[PDB]
Structure formats: C-alpha cells, structure tokens
Amino acid sequence: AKIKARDLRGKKKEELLKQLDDLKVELSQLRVAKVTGGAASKLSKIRVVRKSIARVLTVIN
Amino acid sequence: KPERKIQFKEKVLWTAITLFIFLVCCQIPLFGIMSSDSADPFYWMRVILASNRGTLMELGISPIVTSGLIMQLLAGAKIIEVGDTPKDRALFNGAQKLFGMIITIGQSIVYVMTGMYGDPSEMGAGICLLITIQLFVAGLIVLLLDELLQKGYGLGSGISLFIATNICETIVWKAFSPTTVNTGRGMEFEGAIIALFHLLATRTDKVRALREAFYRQNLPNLMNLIATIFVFAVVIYFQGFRVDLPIKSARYRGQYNTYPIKLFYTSNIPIILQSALVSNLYVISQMLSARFSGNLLVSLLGTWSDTSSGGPARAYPVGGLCHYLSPPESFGSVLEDPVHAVVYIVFMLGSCAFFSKTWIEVSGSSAKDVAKQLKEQQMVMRGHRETSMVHELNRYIPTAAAFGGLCIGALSVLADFLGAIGSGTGILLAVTIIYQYFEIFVKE
Amino acid sequence: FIVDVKANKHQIKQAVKKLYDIDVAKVNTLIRPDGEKKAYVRLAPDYDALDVANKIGII
Amino acid sequence: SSHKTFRIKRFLAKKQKQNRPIPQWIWMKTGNKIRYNSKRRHWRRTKLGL
Amino acid sequence: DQVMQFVEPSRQFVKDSIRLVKRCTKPDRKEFQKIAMATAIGFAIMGFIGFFVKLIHIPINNIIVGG
Ligand SMILES: C=C1CN(S(=O)(=O)c2ccc(C)cc2)CCCN(CC2CCCCC2)CCCN(S(=O)(=O)c2ccc(N(C)C)cc2)C1
Ligand SMILES: [Mg+2]
Numbered sequence: 001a002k003i004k005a006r007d008l009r010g011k012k013k014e015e016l017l018k019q020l021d022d023l024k025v026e027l028s029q030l031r032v033a034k035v036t037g038g039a040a041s042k043l044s045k046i047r048v049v050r051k052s053i054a055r056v057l058t059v060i061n
Numbered sequence: 062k063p064e065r066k067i068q069f070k071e072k073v074l075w076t077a078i079t080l081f082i083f084l085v086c087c088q089i090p091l092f093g094i095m096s097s098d099s100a101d102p103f104y105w106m107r108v109i110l111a112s113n114r115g116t117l118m119e120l121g122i123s124p125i126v127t128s129g130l131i132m133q134l135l136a137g138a139k140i141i142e143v144g145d146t147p148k149d150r151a152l153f154n155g156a157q158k159l160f161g162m163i164i165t166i167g168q169s170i171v172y173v174m175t176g177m178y179g180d181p182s183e184m185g186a187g188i189c190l191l192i193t194i195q196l197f198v199a200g201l202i203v204l205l206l207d208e209l210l211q212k213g214y215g216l217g218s219g220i221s222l223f224i225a226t227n228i229c230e231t232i233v234w235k236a237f238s239p240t241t242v243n244t245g246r247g248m249e250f251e252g253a254i255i256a257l258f259h260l261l262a263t264r265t266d267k268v269r270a271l272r273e274a275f276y277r278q279n280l281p282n283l284m285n286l287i288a289t290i291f292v293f294a295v296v297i298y299f300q301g302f303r304v305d306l307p308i309k310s311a312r313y314r315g316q317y318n319t320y321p322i323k324l325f326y327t328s329n330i331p332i333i334l335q336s337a338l339v340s341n342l343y344v345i346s347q348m349l350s351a352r353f354s355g356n357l358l359v360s361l362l363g364t365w366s367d368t369s370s371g372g373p374a375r376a377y378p379v380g381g382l383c384h385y386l387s388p389p390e391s392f393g394s395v396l397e398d399p400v401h402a403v404v405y406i407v408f409m410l411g412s413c414a415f416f417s418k419t420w421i422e423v424s425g426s427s428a429k430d431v432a433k434q435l436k437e438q439q440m441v442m443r444g445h446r447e448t449s450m451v452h453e454l455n456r457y458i459p460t461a462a463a464f465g466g467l468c469i470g471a472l473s474v475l476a477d478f479l480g481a482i483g484s485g486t487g488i489l490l491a492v493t494i495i496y497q498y499f500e501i502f503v504k505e
Numbered sequence: 506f507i508v509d510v511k512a513n514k515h516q517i518k519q520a521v522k523k524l525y526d527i528d529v530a531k532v533n534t535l536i537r538p539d540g541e542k543k544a545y546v547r548l549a550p551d552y553d554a555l556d557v558a559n560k561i562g563i564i
Numbered sequence: 565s566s567h568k569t570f571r572i573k574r575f576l577a578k579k580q581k582q583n584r585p586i587p588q589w590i591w592m593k594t595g596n597k598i599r600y601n602s603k604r605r606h607w608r609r610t611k612l613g614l
Numbered sequence: 615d616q617v618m619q620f621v622e623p624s625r626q627f628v629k630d631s632i633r634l635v636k637r638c639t640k641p642d643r644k645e646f647q648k649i650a651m652a653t654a655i656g657f658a659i660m661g662f663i664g665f666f667v668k669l670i671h672i673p674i675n676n677i678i679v680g681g
Contacts (some may be wrong), residue, residue, distance in 0.1 A: 028524075032562050037307030037319060041642075080663075088671055090678050226664065233664040239672075297653055301641035304634070314587060324638060456564065457634060464631045495656055540577040564637050 003052040008059045020056045023049055062154065062212040068090040069505040073176055076216045079206055086117035086199050087230075093192050096179045101367060102347060103375050106340035108487055109333065110226040111220075114177075115197035120168065122220055124161035124200070125207050132157065154211055158204040162197055169193035175348055216501060221329075221494045228487040232289060235281040235482050244279065253281040253482075279371050281482060288481030289488070292472070296492045299468055300325060304457050311439040320435070322457050325465045327420045329493040332469060334420075336486035338412055342383050347376050388477065395478075410470035417466035418459060428454035508534075508542045517544050525560070537544050572614075579605070579612060 003023075008016065027049045033042050067075065100114055107113070112121030115278070132153065135141045144150035172178035173189055181189065183211040212217045238251030247263035249256035260273045274283050302324035310316045346363035353359065364380030367373075370390075378384040385404035395402040421427055432450045435441070442450055473485030481488065508517060512533040521529055528549035536542050548554055558564055568576075586601050605612070641649065 029562070036563050037305055037317070039305070039319075039639075040317075043317075084667055088667060088674055090675050092652045092678065226660070226667075230664040230667060233661050234668050237665070238668065293653075293657075294650070295649060298641065298646070301645075301649065302635075302638045304638055314584070457637070460627075460634050463627070464634060467631075495653070495660075498650065499656065501618055536573065538577060539581060540574065559633050559636055564633065 001056060002048075005059055008056065013060065016056060016060055018061075020053065023053045023056065027053065029050045062151070062208045062214065063214050067214070072216055072505075073502075075214060076222070078221055079210065079219060082202060082206055083219075083226065084116075086202065087113065087227070089117050090115045091117055091119060091196075091199075093188075093195070094124070096177070099177055101373060102175060102177065103340055103344045105336065105486065106344045108224075108228055108484060108490075109337045109340050111223040113458060118203065120165065120196040120200040122203075122223060123168065124164035125204060126220060127164065128157040153199060154208045158201070158208065161200070161204055162383075165193060165197045165200060168196075171348075174352065201357045204228065206478060217497060221497060224490050225494045225498070228483065229491050230492075232483045232487075236286050242280065249280055251280065253277070253283050253286050256280045257283050280481070281371070285480055285482040288476070289483060292476035292479065292481045292485075292488055293492060295475070296488065298473055299472060300492060300496060304461065306453070306457075307442055308435065308440050309443050311441050318440075320440075322461055323465075324461060325493065326426065326458065326462045326469060327417040327465065328497065329421045329490060330424075331416040331466050332473070332486055332489045332493075334416045335409060335412045335422040335470075336484075336490070337382050339409065340385065342386060342433055343378060345373065346378065346381065346383055392478075406470075406474050409473065410467060413470045414463050414466035421458065421462045426458075428458045431458075469498075506544045506546065508544050510536060510540070510542050512542065512544075517546065521546055527557055527559060575614075 003045060028044070030042060030046050034046065094115060097115075107121075110121035110123050110126070111118075112123075113119040113248060132143060144153055161324065169178075169189060169192075172193075173181040173184070178184070178189075178192065184192070203223070206215060207219055209215055210217075212395060234251070236252055237254055239255070240251045240260075241248060242251060243249075247260060249259040249263070256277060257270075257274060260270055260277075264270055264273075300323075304322035305319040306322060308318045308320040310318075343363065346359070347365045350359050350363065350365055360380060362381050363378040365376040365384040366379045367376050377390070378387040382404075385401040386408045387401060388405050389398065389402035429451050432447060432454055435450065436447060441447075445453065469489055473489055476488050477485040506521075507516075512520075512534075514534060517532050517534065518529045521527065528551075530547040530549050532547070533545040534542055548557065582602075583604060586598065587606070590596060590598060
C-alpha cells in the first residue's frame with residue numbers, strides 16, 4: 001500500500017519507469033474522480049500518489 | 062395514538078418489546094381447530110402475508126397490507142380527505158383497524174369455503190364466529206401496535222419486522238432443530254447441521270457421510286445451508302452498488318456531499334408485489350378449481366395435485382399456463398421441462414422490472430420529484446441549473462430502477478437454482494428488510 | 506478538458522490520442538478568465554463522445 | 565478593453581482568483597485571529613492600479 | 615425493417631445498463647469485510663432470538679397438546 005524508497009534502489013530503470021507510468025495514470029484517474037465527485041477516501045489518496053511519484057522520480061535521478 | 066420523546070436505546074428497546082409482542086403470538090398454537098388433512102393452499106402465499114397455521118397470528122397481514130392501498134386509491138380520485146388535523150388523523154388509523162375487522166370477516170368466509178378451517182355447517186354459524194373473533198384479537202394486538210408504530214413509537218414499519226422474524230426464523234429452524242424424525246434408516250435431528258453430526262455416529266463409512274452431506278432430501282440438505290450463506294453474500298455485494306452524485310449547498314463554499322442512487326432504487330416493493338402476483342395466480346386457481354371444476358378455462362388457468370417434498374405434499378400447478386410460470390422442481394425438471402422452467406424466469410424477472418419502473422413513478426421518486434426535493438433542501442450540483450438537475454438524474458433513475466429489478470430477479474433465480482434454504486423471494490425480503498433497519502441503527 | 510497554458514493544439518491532440526486511444530477530428534482552445542486553458546476536442550465521426558466519456562468516468 | 569495582452573490577462577486572472585472570502589473552517593481553528601478577509605476589492609471602489 | 619426497431623430498445627437498454635455498471639461505485643475490499651461482518655453479527659443476533667423462540671416453542675405446544 002505504501003511505496004518506499006528503500007526497496008526501489010536495486011531495481012533498474014525500465015520497471016522504475018513502468019511503475020512511474022502506473023502511478024501517473026492512477027493520479028489522473030484520482031483527479032477526474034475528484035472532479036466528478038468521489039469519496040473522501042479517494043480524495044485523500046491524491047497526496048499519497050503525488051508523493052509516491054516524487055519518490056520514484058527522486059530515486060531515478 | 063400519541064407521541065413522546067424517545068432516545069435511541071429506548072428506541073431499540075421499543076423495537077424489542079414490539080417484537081416479543083409479535084413473538085408471543087407467533088409461538089403459541091391456536092385452539093378449537095380439528096381439521097389438518099389439507100393445510101396447503103400455497104407455501105409462497107403464506108410468506109407474503111407472514112400468515113401461519115394453528116398459530117395465534119395465522120390471520121396474516123392482509124388487512125394491514127391492503128387497507129393502506131384503499132386509503133391511497135381514494136386519495137388519487139380525491140374521493141375523501143385524509144386527516145390534516147390531529148383529531149381527524151387519530152381516526153383513519155383506527156377506522157382502518159375497524160375496516161380490518163370487515164377484512165377479517167372476509168377471511169372467515171374464505172376459511173369456511175376453502176375448508177382448511179372446516180365445513181361451514183359442521184362448525185355451525187356460532188362456532189365459526191367464535192374462532193373468527195378470537196383470530197381478530199391476535200391480529201388486533203398487531204393492528205394497535207401498527208397504529209402505535211405508525212405514530213412513531215414503533216421504529217419504521219412493523220410489517221417488515223413481522224416478515225423479518227417470520228421467513229428468517231424458518232431458515233434458522235431448518236439449520237438447527239432438536240426434534241428427531243426417523244424412517245428407521247438412521248437417527249437424525251431436524252436441523253441440517255445436527256442431522257450431519259447424527260449421521261456420523263449412524264455410519265462409520267466416510268463415503269456414505271459425504272453422500273448424505275451432498276444429498277439429504279427427506280431432511281433439509283446440508284448443501285442448502287451453504288447455498289443460503291452464499292446467496293446472502295452475493296445479494297450483499299449487489300446491494301452495495303450505488304451512484305454518487307455531487308451535491309453542494311446553495312450558499313456555502315467547498316461543501317462536498319453525494320446524493321446516493323443505489324442499484325436497488327425500489328428497495329423491496331417490486332419483490333413484495335412480485336412474490337404477491339405469483340402467489341396469487343396460484344392461490345385463486347387452486348381455490349376456484351376446487352369449488353367449480355370441469356370447465357376448460359379453469360383447468361387452462363391451472364390443474365392442482367399434491368406431491369410430498371421432504372414434508373407435506375404441495376399442490377403444484379400440474380397443468381395450466383401457471384405451470385409454465387411455476388418453478389422447476391428439480392435440475393432434472395429443468396432438463397425435462399425447460400419451457401415451464403424458462404417461462405418461470407421471464408415472468409418473474411419481467412414483473413419485478415415492470416413493477417420497479419412503474420413503482421418509481423407511483424411513489425413520487427422520479428427524477429423530477431427528487432430534483433424538486435433537492436430544491437426544497439437548497440441543494441444544487443456544481444455548474445448546473447435545476448433543469449439540468451432533472452436531466453442528470455434521468456440519466457440514471459429509470460435505468461437504475463430497471464436494472465435493479467433485473468438484478469434482483471436474476472439473484473432470486475440463481476439462489477433458487479443453487480437450491481439454498483428458503484424461497485428466493487424470502488431471501489430477497491430478508492436482506493432488504495434487515496438493511497432498512499441497519500441504516501437506521503448506523504444513523505443513530 | 507482543462508489543460509495548462511503551455512500546450513499546443515497539436516500537443517493536446519497527441520496527448521488525447523495516446524491516453525484514450527481514440528481519434529480526434531479537431532481541437533479548439535481558449536483561455537478561461539481564471540487562468541487555465543479549456544480545450545474542446547472534436548472526435549472522429551466513427552467515435553461517439555458518450556462512450557469515451559463513459560470510459561473516462563464522467564457521464 | 566477586449567484587446568488585451570497575455571500578461572495583462574494573467575494578472576487579471578490572479579487578481580480575480582484572490583477575491584474570494586475565507587473558508588468557514590478557518591475562524592474556529594485554535595491559534596486564529598482572523599475574522600474575515602480584509603483584502604477584498606470591489607471594481608467600483610478601488611481601480612486595481614494598472 | 616421492423617426488427618431493428620424491435621431490438622433497439624433492448625440495444626440501448628443493455629448499452630446504458632453496462633454504462634451504469636461502469637458508473638456505479640464498487641464496495642471496497644475493506645468495506646466489503648466491514649459490511650459483511652456487520653451483516654453477520656446482525657444474522658447472529660436474530661439467529662439467537664430465533665433459537666430462543668424455537669426452543670420455547672416445544673414446551674408451549676407440549677402443554678397445549680396436554681391441555
Ligand atoms: C391466511 C391464509 C392464506 N392462504 S388462503 O387460505 O388461501 C387466503 C388467501 C387470501 C386471503 C385474503 C385469505 C386467505 C394461502 C396460504 C396458505 N399457507 C399454507 C401454509 C404454508 C406452510 C405450511 C402450512 C400451510 C398458510 C397460511 C395460512 N393459511 S392456512 O394454513 O391454510 C389456515 C389459516 C387459518 C385456519 N383456521 C384454523 C381458521 C386454518 C388454516 C390461510
Ligand atoms: Mg470610477
């Protein structure tokens with residue numbers, strides 16, 4: 001449920017980019033759900049997906 | 062009946078004491094009846110009325126479940142004005158109970174003519190009157206409780222509670238009961254679970270025990286209980302399906318609310334009416350056929366014969382179009398009579414779907430009505446006028462009603478096909494009936 | 506759609522085509538009084554907008 | 565003016581976005597001294613400079 | 615011919631119905647367990663009251679048969 005930077009270090013670039021793409025599409029779905037009216041549970045997840053994207057990008061760089 | 066200040070724990074206690082008032086009538090057997098040879102006008106018909114045999118409340122819920130329709134029918138043609146003042150109000154509720162006594166008199170005519178109560182001459186006019194009056198007293202405690210509840214002392218509506226502890230209790234008895242029935246093959250208790258434990262003592266062989274576990278036709282089969290839990294679970298998952306509509310206050314910022322549109326927009330009315338039409342087609346056909354027979358039309362409606370099914374023989378629509386509408390008795394019966402088997406599905410599915418679609422517009426739950434409601438609660442949707450409110454609601458409401466009817470019909474059909482304990486109509490009533498109680502309790 | 510002010514019509518067309526694997530007939534963009542760019546994306550005739558909106562989540 | 569530049573339109577957009585009142589859940593935080601938005605601007609009264 | 619207008623109500627019905635199914639929110643797994651446990655404890659309590667009812671059935675009908 002929680003994406004952490006400790007276990008992303010050994011992985012190589014390809015699956016890191018794949019996971020980044022999955023996080024991006026999840027974030028887009030979260031945003032459209034927020035606009036059309038969704039549960040507070042889905043609203044709260046936006047920050048966690050944004051921070052997971054930040055973690056993945058930081059590890060890549 | 063008046064109203065007073067009440068609190069939630071006192072409210073559940075009031076639901077409790079009302080349910081034991083129901084239970085003392087449900088448990089105690091009636092006296093003065095000495096005719097048990099027939100005892101099968103319709104199993105399904107009894108369920109809708111929550112009626113009983115040889116019990117205090119065998120009277121049924123018919124009057125309380127119809128009298129209300131008469132008041133609504135008069136209002137539509139505006140024949141009479143219902144109470145709009147407290148003294149006028151304190152009348153219809155009661156007068157309806159008095160009209161219920163007239164409905165009980167109709168039941169007394171039905172009881173003597175059907176012959177389940179007995180021959181009219183053998184009881185005699187006076188003795189027939191004594192039993193009819195005594196049944197009305199058992200019904201009357203329910204009818205006065207209905208007025209007490211109608212005012213609001215009772216939680217919601219008691220009609221659901223009577224079914225809630227009527228169709229479910231029977232499933233609970235089938236699951237475990239300490240009475241033993243012996244054909245001499247083995248010693249087993251009435252409860253399906255107890256019967257399996259008794260079978261293990263009866264037979265050392267593991268294979269015979271698994272054969273009994275799969276198939277135990279004379280007693281409730283163990284497999285049926287497993288199916289009953291599975292069908293309850295699938296109906297729960299279907300019950301959850303909802304549509305979230307962004308609803309916002311007309312004068313506040315950043316306020317996010319959702320107006321829920323559940324898949325089952327009509328919660329139980331399609332099934333209560335449907336379980337009602339299928340029971341009726343059969344109930345009149347058996348009664349009319351017995352009084353007057355040898356007419357091609359009455360045989361064409363239905364032919365009736367009783368075959369024992371792990372209990373007393375049940376009159377089946379052996380002949381007539383009601384047979385095609387009638388359920389398939391066995392998986393082999395579906396193979397042997399796909400026609401009636403299938404007809405049995407289109408009529409039930411279609412009736413619920415038609416009854417739902419029509420129920421949403423009968424009860425004032427249409428998109429326009431609910432939009433008007435949201436208007437009197439100063440509720441709006443973001444970036445939308447009220448006409449678009451109606452249009453947005455229309456995108457879901459009729460489709461939601463139709464597919465809710467379709468889903469409940471399909472779920473009942475699947476539950477019956479899997480051979481779970483109890484009628485599919487009964488299982489449907491139980492889940493929705495508990496859910497209305499569940500929402501009130503969570504609301505507390 | 507709502508997009509950012511740094512997107513060309515070509516970029517919007519390409520982004521929609523990749524994200525939603527559909528075809529775009531044309532794009533008309535304006536900049537709202539509040540700041541972000543609003544894009545009207547007209548699809549090919551053989552694609553209807555209602556089913557794409559279904560797949561999106563807005564109905 | 566209907567004819568306007570991109571930066572002028574952007575500045576106008578920011579100023580318009582800034583003109584909303586405070587959220588009702590602000591004033592009943594703990595360490596709060598704000599009663600209302602005191603920087604609200606009306607188009608008739610103050611003329612935005614420019 | 616007329617068969618297209620016969621099946622078009624069915625066609626739009628299934629189309630808008632699977633559309634609604636796409637729109638309808640699904641119960642979450644944690645929510646599924648929560649609601650299932652709530653319905654299960656409700657089942658248990660009504661089963662308990664019904665067990666008491668069916669067990670007190672026996673003495674009262676035994677008495678009635680006796681008198
Ligand atoms: C009230 C009814 C309903 N009916 S109905 O007659 O067609 C009828 C219909 C419409 C109206 C307006 C009135 C009556 C049909 C369903 C019969 N289910 C079958 C049960 C199923 C389980 C296993 C035992 C049998 C029993 C429900 C009670 N029954 S009852 O058992 O037959 C009965 C009731 C009272 C007496 N007494 C002593 C007066 C005797 C028998 C009647
Ligand atoms: Mg001036």
